[PDB]
Design a protein around this ligand. Sequence first.
Ligand SMILES: NC(=O)c1ccc[n+]([C@@H]2O[C@H](COP(=O)([O-])OP(=O)(O)OC[C@H]3O[C@@H](n4cnc5c(N)ncnc54)[C@H](OP(=O)(O)O)[C@@H]3O)[C@@H](O)[C@H]2O)c1
Length: 281
Amino acid sequence: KERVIITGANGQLGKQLQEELNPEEYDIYPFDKKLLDITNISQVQQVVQEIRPHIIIHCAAYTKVDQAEKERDLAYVINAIGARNVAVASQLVGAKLVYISTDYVFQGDRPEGYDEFHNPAPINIYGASKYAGEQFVKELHNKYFIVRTSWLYGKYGNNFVKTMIRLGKEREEISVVADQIGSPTYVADLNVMINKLIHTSLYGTYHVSNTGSCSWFEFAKKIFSYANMKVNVLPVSTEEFGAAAARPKYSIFQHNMLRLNGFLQMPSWEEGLERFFIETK
Ligand SMILES: NC(=O)c1ccc[n+]([C@@H]2O[C@H](COP(=O)([O-])OP(=O)(O)OC[C@H]3O[C@@H](n4cnc5c(N)ncnc54)[C@H](OP(=O)(O)O)[C@@H]3O)[C@@H](O)[C@H]2O)c1
């Protein structure tokens, strides 16, 4: 009857991960920002000592990509220092640590993607802050799973899929960026993989995302395809959209670690999106 702590339980993952972990196997201890402030080490240790968990799924993070450029110290304090504090505590209790990371740790300029062994080169403050976060984890703990994902969206909270369906009903046409390729990842599919990793000790860095490349534009079209909504999508560039943070033109991962560790391949983003509508009918 293992114990699992989830940091940042109110976010997209925490909110949905908390519901997908089998309760008749683990004692799920979710914590919000106020009940477990990642930036307060004294508090982090108190909570981790008392509950003393076997597993810790660290979802807490500052996910404001654009504003990250204007508030750098705040990006690091949360993403870097925060991961360092949770790392320390994880070590004192000997808990397996799952650190969720991103594809912004790379330049994202290669169409085929990057494997878990290529040296990262953060493209923006957000990416750099979590890379620093990953390093404190490897440096201060020895039972972890660095899970990099991208274009994550789930049942709870606002996301690109809910926005299209919301705006789609009112518009006759809608313009979406089409010069940024990526791979939409549905939380449910990610959680399934996280769940598989926590039952083992195959520690390391893993890229978990849905299969196939895509683009907000093509993704947008297919969202309306399954939604069965007749609306047009106009392809626009990044310069006309005006971005305060520099996204990559190719944010795709190579799924080596999963394939090298006997795990099966993730479903396609196309297929990951299907189960989204099915579950949120
Ligand atoms: N497209 C994506 O979303 C994407 C892509 C790549 C990687 N990731 C990573 O995936 C992970 C999952 O995050 P998400 O997608 O669920 O985004 P999210 O909804 O913003 O989740 C992050 C949560 O952490 C909380 N938090 C902020 N400061 C905290 C603190 N000091 N202590 C504890 N919690 C704090 C936030 O609460 P408040 O909002 O109330 O402050 C928020 O609920 C993140 O670590 C993110 O870096 C996400």
